[PDB]
Every structure is written in structure tokens, then in C-alpha cells.
């Protein structure tokens, strides 16, 4: 009837890719985060920001290429193309590291626009919105690492660059400087990721091994029409199996599939709380009862004090080349070496 | 009628509370001895010379540790790969000093887990099930035997084996990074994709079932009570969750077949952990990951740094600091 | 129209037998004519270091960062 | 009309000429440490 109704009926039309209202936020912003990454890893260097090479023009393969974080002198500037740093020039915008905030900002509005996509399709199909709530897990890892972690730090420079090996140094930068593995929020996150991979490997292998005979063929994939009301696997058998192997087992398909949602997602929320606590440098660095004892008793050694000496090697050896803006000129005689290494 | 037939009828009975089976004849004595020695060695066990340099590393709770720092320490560098039981130790005090209980726990563990795996086969045979849950459990058995058995073999000592603890795990992972460069190795890459993908398709499948549940309860009681146990009606509209994901990405990327869907949940992690556990295995024999250090040069020939060179300087920090007294010669051959 | 009925048709491969090589070679000429080094400011292998500047160039200012990169890219 | 398996054959070996070209330039040109 009205003008709003014609636009509402056009976006929600059955077509190849469902656009909806949320596609106006997703499809422009996701196309430019992805294309900003493919351009930045192919053409744009890191020679002026980090003093590296992170492009395909500079000989890096898929692994050692990245879209890199800007300089520490930029601080937390948004680095707009028209801004006071770039001033409209495209070429000087790329050399300062403007594509990285271009990827991260238009990417953050892609994950907004993709989670709104999951509320919109669920309302048209008419289902409960648990996909949009389980996808809030990965939103809490993008925001609290690519956004909330460099905000608490000195600049955008201490953020993960969007490249394969550039994530890998961020894994190593976070052990030596922060002792991230000791943090109980990672420990509750590893329990959800390795726990979530566990549940789909079991529920994959128990459904597929309690199937009913619905055909004479040896292939069991053929014997399932999608619109049938009979269940395709014996729940009573699978309960009787695991009650004797493992001792305790699900007797509820509604509780089972909810539990496959809770376990992976909670590991992304609990691990997201800790990385917000490392923006503020509130790290779980030391057990002081272990540290006061190892100072007074020069014979008491645990595995825990062995990890601190591994972190002095990370804090001293890479920090010269890690942070060229700070100009660490270490002598050879201050770098902690071991015996004969 | 015979005594053996009345014993085979009991040991293979599915009417027991826990199925014992013929693999339980060597699962249960193995894993209860790995357990009962682990609880004692984690709580009350004296310090252990791990580096073979007579610098004993404390690992138990009574010697001032906690849950995180306490760990069953691996055996000595002095022993190395030699089999060191209690009777070949001339006292228990000489046994506990040189890293005794690490070999008693690990060898009774790998026998009991390889028997827990065959026990999952056996009950599937006696219940009429198709058999292959135990093939999915091969993937953590591959990974448990990689860090406790295969990596001490190729490195030639159980002292390079994984410490049974929590802080000892991260001593194992970081020293393995400096000496082998696991992150650049494509088999740790193929299993990070296995568990990121595994936790994806777990929470992606578990949401689309819970989204499309059928009304069987009221708003006061729980959602879960609309499933009566052993019912024959399907508890969720699978056509509904197919039409949702058929619009969320596109139409042809959606499994309408629930059997092929529930197979892909078992394929992706298990193949990802088979491949990963043969990353530790091929890096047990010093076939390390990629090494792109000093790979990008200018026309003058000066080395231009990459992200692998920054990653190298993190590896050089752990390499020059791990086992800071055990080395005497310029190259860590072990 | 179904997707597999498109790519098996001849009229599809009539059009895209011209457009694909005319677009792949334009991606070749975008590099071999030295154009990509000037749009994105990526250093050529000749010009990581210069005769004067022998260190690693870094930006050291918030607001005159455009002017400082005018300095480090002339020589 | 073209048989579909001919299409996946020609495009499939075209990818191999693209991939093995990329593993070629890991040992030559830039990024080869020569």
C-alpha cells in the first residue's frame, strides 16, 4: 500500500540471496572488510609502520602476509581517509596503516549486520532465535580482541594484524608479556573449544552408529527422506551404550542439542572476559607464594618458575624488533642467555 | 555348565551395570593403577631430577604447590629412554628421585586407553550397533600417544615427554615451539581448523535443533520436558531448520539429509586430530614446520623482515632459555 | 535459471571467452607496468633503503604523518 | 551443450596450473631467499 510496504515486500522477496533489511548493513560492510583484507595483504606494505614486509608484492606467501596495525605515533586515531592524518590522500593512508582500521571498523559493522540477519530470517521462518544468540559468542571475541584490547593498550599497534603469521606473533606476544595461558579465563575457554569439538565428534559418531535399517542398500546415506516423522536413530540404544561405557548419558534430545550450544559458546564468553582484563594489564602473572619462596630458597624449583624464565626470553629477545618505535637498543650482555646457547 | 562358560557369560554380559568385556580385563587393572599412582604422585611425591643435572624439580602438593603448578614430573635425562620399573631401582627412594612414577602412570595409561577404545567396540558388537564409535575415539588416542609415547621416542628420552600437570603442559608447548616451530607446521594448522570448525558445527547444529523445537510444553515448565524418553515421534521440525540455513547462506549449502549432516560432525574434528597428532609425530623426528626466516631480500641483498622474523625472535627467546643449565654445547640436538 | 544449466551452455562460453582473458591480462598489466607500486605506495625492490636513509623508516608524529612520509619517500 | 565433466576437467587442471605456479615462485623470484 504505502511506500514503506513496497520496500518491505521487496527486500523480503524469495530470491537467490536473502537481502532483507539487514542486508543493507551487512552486504556493504562485509564486502569492504573482505576486500580490504585481500587488497591489504596483496599490495599494501608494512614497511613504514612496523618495518616489515607483509604483502605479496614483497615476496610474502599466504602465511607471512598481513594487513598490519598502524604506528604507535598514530595512537588510537580512527585514521579516516579524510582525517587529519591521511588528509584525503589514498597512498599516504595505506602507508600509515589506514586499511587496518578500515578492515576492523567495516568488519565490526559486518558482525553487527550479520547477527541482525539471524534475527530477521528467524522471524520470517518463524523459529526461536538461538542462532543469533550463539553467534554472539564470536562477536565477543572480535570485539574484545580486535577492538577492546588495543583501546586499553597504548595504541592500535598492539592489536592482532589480519594475517596468518601476524596472529601467530600475537599468540607469542601474549605469553611473554602477559602470561595469558595462566589466566583462568583462557582455561575456561580451552575447555569450551576442546569441549565443543568433543561433543560434535561424539554426537556425530553416535547418531551415525545407531541408525535404523530403512533400506536394503549398504549405503545408509540414501535411506533418509527429509520430511519423515520417524526418528532416524535409536535413542534408547545410544543411551544404553554410553550408560555402560562412560557411566552417564543423555536421555533427552532437547537437552543434548542445547548442551551442544552452551559448551562452545560459553568458552568464547569466558575467554572474552579475560582479554578485557588484559587491556588493563590486570594479568595473572605470578603466584606470590611461589615467588617469595623461590627468592628466599635458591633450590626450590617448580614447572611454574620454569615458565617465567621462558618469558624473560620472550620479553627480551623479541622486544627489540617488536617495537621499533621505542628504539630498544639492547647490548649483547643484557640479553638473558642460558648456558652455551 | 562349565566354570569358564559361566565366567564368559558374566564378563560379556550387557546386563552388568558397567560393561566389562574382554578389553576390560586389561582396561580396569591398567587404569586403576594409573589412577591410584597418579593421585599419590600428584599429592605426595618428592622432587625429581628431570634435567639429569641433580637439580630436583618439585611437582607435588605437599612440597608447596597448587593445582596449577603441581605436576607429575617426567623421568630423568639420566635414564632417558630406558625402561625403569620399581624392581630395577634398588629402592623406592632411588625410584622416586629419578622420575619413577612418570613411567608407571604413562605406560599403564596408554594400555588402558587403547583398551578403553577396544571396549567401545565390543559393546557395540553385543548391542547390535554399527561399530565405529571407537574409530572416532582413535583421534585423542592418537594425540595421547603422540605426546607421551612417540615424542619421547624420537627425542630419545622420556624427559622430553609431557609433564602430567597444568603448568607442565605450558612448559611443554612453549619448548616445543622454539625447537620445532609447530605453528608454521601445516598439521597444527589442520587441527586448529579441526577444533575451531568442530566448535563451530557443534554450536551451529545445536542451535538449529533448539531453534526448531515443536510445542509440547507450557511457558511455565521447562523446554526440555517436551521430549519423553524413548518416544518415536520426531522432536523438531527438520524442514524448518533446513529452510532457515537455506536462506542464511544460500540454498545449496544446506544438508537436507540428517544422516549426512550427523556424519559431517564426526568427520571434521576427527580428521583434524588424526592429522594433528601426526604433526607431533613427524616433529618428534625433527622434521620441523616451515622456516621463512631471512626469506625476503632487496636487490642489494639486505634482509627485509617479515612476520616470520618477528616470530623467530620469539622462538630464539625460548630456545636460549629452556633447560638453562642442561646444555653444554652450542646446538640443542635434543 | 539453474546454475549448472548456465555453465554448460555454449552462449555462456561465447561471452566469457573474451572477458576472462581481457580481465586477467589487465591484472597482469596492472603489475608489469609498475602501476601497483604507485597507487598503494609499496616499495619496489630497489627502494627499501636509499643512499642516505640506511635505517628502517618509521612514522613518529600524530598529525604531520603525511608530511613525514613525504620526506621518507622522495630519496 | 557441453558435458559438465569436461568443464570440471578443464577448469580443474587450470587451477593446478595456478597453484603449482604459486609453489614455483616460492623457489624463484621474490621471497625465495636466493
Amino acid at each position: 500500500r504505502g511506500l514503506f510496504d513496497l520496500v518491505d515486500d521487496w527486500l523480503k522477496k524469495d530470491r537467490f540471496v536473502f537481502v532483507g533489511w539487514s542486508g543493507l548493513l551487512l552486504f556493504p560492510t562485509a564486502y569492504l572488510a573482505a576486500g580490504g583484507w585481500m587488497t591489504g595483504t596483496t599490495f599494501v606494505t608494512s614497511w613504514y609502520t612496523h618495518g616489515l614486509a607483509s604483502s605479496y608484492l614483497e615476496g610474502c606467501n599466504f602465511l607471512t602476509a598481513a594487513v598490519s596495525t598502524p604506528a604507535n605515533s598514530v595512537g588510537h586515531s580512527l585514521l579516516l581517509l579524510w582525517g587529519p592524518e591521511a588528509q584525503g590522500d589514498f597512498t599516504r593512508w595505506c602507508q600509515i596503516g589506514g586499511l587496518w582500521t578500515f578492515v576492523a571498523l567495516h568488519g565490526a559493522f559486518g558482525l553487527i549486520g550479520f547477527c541482525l540477519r539471524q534475527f530477521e530470517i528467524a522471524r520470517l521462518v518463524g523459529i526461536r532465535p538461538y542462532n543469533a544468540i550463539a553467534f554472539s559468542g564470536p562477536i565477543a571475541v572480535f570485539v574484545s580482541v580486535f577492538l577492546l584490547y588495543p583501546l586499553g593498550q597504548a595504541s592500535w599497534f598492539f592489536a592482532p594484524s589480519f594475517g596468518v603469521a601476524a596472529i601467530f606473533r600475537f599468540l607469542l606476544f601474549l605469553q611473554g608479556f602477559h602470561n595469558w595461558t595462566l589466566n583462568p579465563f583462557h582455561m575456561m575457554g580451552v575447555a569450551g573449544i576442546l569441549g565443543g569439538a568433543l561433543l560434535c565428534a561424539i554426537h556425530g559418531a553416535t547418531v551415525e552408529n545407531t541408525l535404523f535399517e530403512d533400506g536394503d542398500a549398504a549405503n545408509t546415506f540414501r535411506a533418509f527422506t527429509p520430511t519423515q516423522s520417524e526418528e532416524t536413530y535409536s535413542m534408547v540404544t545410544a543411551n544404553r551404550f554410553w550408560s555402560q561405557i562412560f557411566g552417564v548419558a543423555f536421555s533427552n534430545k532437547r537437552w543434548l542439542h542445547f548442551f551442544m550450544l552452551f559448551v562452545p559458546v560459553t568458552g568464547l564468553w569466558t575467554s572474552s572476559i579475560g582479554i578485557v582484563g588484559l587491556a588493563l594489564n590486570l594479568r595473572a602473572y605470578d603466584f606470590v607464594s611461589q615467588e617469595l619462596r623461590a627468592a628466599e630458597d635458591p633450590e626450590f624449583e617448580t614447572f611454574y618458575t620454569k615458565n617465567h624464565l621462558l618469558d624473560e626470553g620472550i620479553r627480551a629477545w623479541m622486544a627489540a624488533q617488536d617495537q621499533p618505535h621505542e628504539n630498544f637498543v639492547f647490548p649483547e650482555e643484557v640479553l638473558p642467555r642460558g648456558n652455551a646457547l | 555348565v562349565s566354570l569358564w562358560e559361566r565366567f564368559c557369560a558374566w564378563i560379556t554380559s550387557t546386563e552388568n551395570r558397567l560393561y566389562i568385556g574382554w578389553f576390560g580385563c586389561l582396561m580396569f587393572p591398567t587404569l586403576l593403577t594409573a589412577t591410584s599412582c597418579f593421585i599419590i604422585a600428584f599429592i605426595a611425591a618428592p622432587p625429581v631430577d628431570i634435567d639429569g643435572i641433580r637439580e630436583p624439580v618439585a611437582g607435588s602438593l605437599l612440597y608447596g604447590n597448587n593445582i596449577i603448578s603441581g605436576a607429575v614430573v617426567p623421568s630423568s635425562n639420566a635414564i632417558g629412554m630406558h625402561f625403569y620399573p620399581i624392581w630395577e631401582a634398588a629402592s623406592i627412594d632411588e625410584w622416586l628421585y629419578n622420575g619413577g612414577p612418570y613411567q608407571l602412570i604413562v605406560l599403564h595409561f596408554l594400555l588402558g586407553v587403547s583398551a578403553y577404545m577396544g571396549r567401545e567396540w565390543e559393546l557395540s558388537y553385543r548391542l547390535g550397533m554399527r561399530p565405529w564409535i571407537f574409530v572416532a575415539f582413535s583421534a585423542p588416542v592418537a594425540a595421547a600417544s603422540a605426546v607421551f609415547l612417540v615424542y619421547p621416542i624420537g627425542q630419545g628420552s622420556f624427559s622430553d615427554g609431557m609433564p602430567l600437570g597444568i603448568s607442565g603442559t605450558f612448559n611443554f608447548m612453549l619448548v616445543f615451539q622454539a625447537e620445532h616451530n609447530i605453528l608454521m607446521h601445516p598439521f597444527h594448522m589442520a587441527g586448529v581448523a579441526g577444533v575451531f570448525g568442530g566448535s563451530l558445527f557443534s554450536a551451529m547444529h545445536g542451535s538449529l535443533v533448539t531453534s526448531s523445537l515443536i510445542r509440547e510444553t507450557t511457558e511455565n515448565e521447562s523446554t526440555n520436558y517436551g521430549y519423553k524418553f524413548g518416544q518415536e515421534e520426531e522432536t523438531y521440525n527438520i524442514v524448518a531448520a533446513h529452510g532457515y540455513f537455506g536462506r542464511l547462506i544460500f540454498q545449496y549449502a544446506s544438508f537436507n539429509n540428517s544422516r549426512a549432516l550427523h556424519f559431517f560432525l564426526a568427520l571434521w574434528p576427527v580428521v583434524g586430530i588424526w592429522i594433528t597428532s601426526m604433526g607431533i609425530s613427524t616433529m618428534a623426528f625433527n622434521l620441523n614446520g616451515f622456516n621463512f626466516n631471512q626469506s625476503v631480500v632487496d636487490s642489494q641483498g639486505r634482509v627485509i623482515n617479515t612476520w616470520a622474523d618477528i616470530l623467530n625472535r620469539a622462538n630464539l627467546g625460548i630456545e636460549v632459555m629452556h633447560e638453562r643449565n642442561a646444555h653444554n654445547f652450542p646446538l640443542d640436538l635434543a | 535459471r539453474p546454475f549448472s544449466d548456465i555453465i554448460t551452455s555454449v552462449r555462456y562460453w561465447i561471452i566469457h571467452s573474451i572477458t576472462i582473458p581481457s580481465l586477467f591480462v589487465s591484472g597482469w598489466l596492472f603489475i608489469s607496468t609498475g602501476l601497483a607500486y604507485d597507487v598503494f605506495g609499496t616499495p619496489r625492490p630497489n627502494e627499501y633503503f636509499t643512499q642516505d636513509r640506511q635505517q628502517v623508516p618509521l612514522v613518529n608524529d600524530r598529525f604531520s604523518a603525511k608530511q613525514e612520509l613525504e620526506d621518507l619517500t622522495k630519496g | 551443450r557441453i558435458p559438465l565433466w569436461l568443464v570440471g576437467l578443464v577448469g580443474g587442471l587450470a587451477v593446478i596450473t595456478m597453484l603449482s605456479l604459486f609453489f614455483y615462485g616460492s623457489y624463484s623470484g621474490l621471497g625465495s631467499s636466493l
Binding site: 530470491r15 605479496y56 | - | 597482469w28 | 604459486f22
Partner: peptide
């Protein structure tokens, strides 16, 4: 029409692969 949907993703992809094959033959 869906000619704007695919070719926003495929016309760039062939253009960048025209550049990635050219970078294999560039040396110092």
C-alpha cells in the same frame, strides 16, 4: 538480477589472480 551478485566477487578475483601470477616472475 543476480549478475550483480556473482560478478562483484568474481570480476575482482580474476583480476587479483592476474597479479599474483605476475608476482611469481618478479625478482630483485
Amino acid at each position: 538480477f543476480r549478475w550483480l551478485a556473482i560478478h562483484g566477487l568474481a570480476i575482482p578475483t580474476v583480476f587479483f589472480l592476474g597479479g599474483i601470477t605476475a608476482m611469481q616472475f618478479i625478482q630483485r
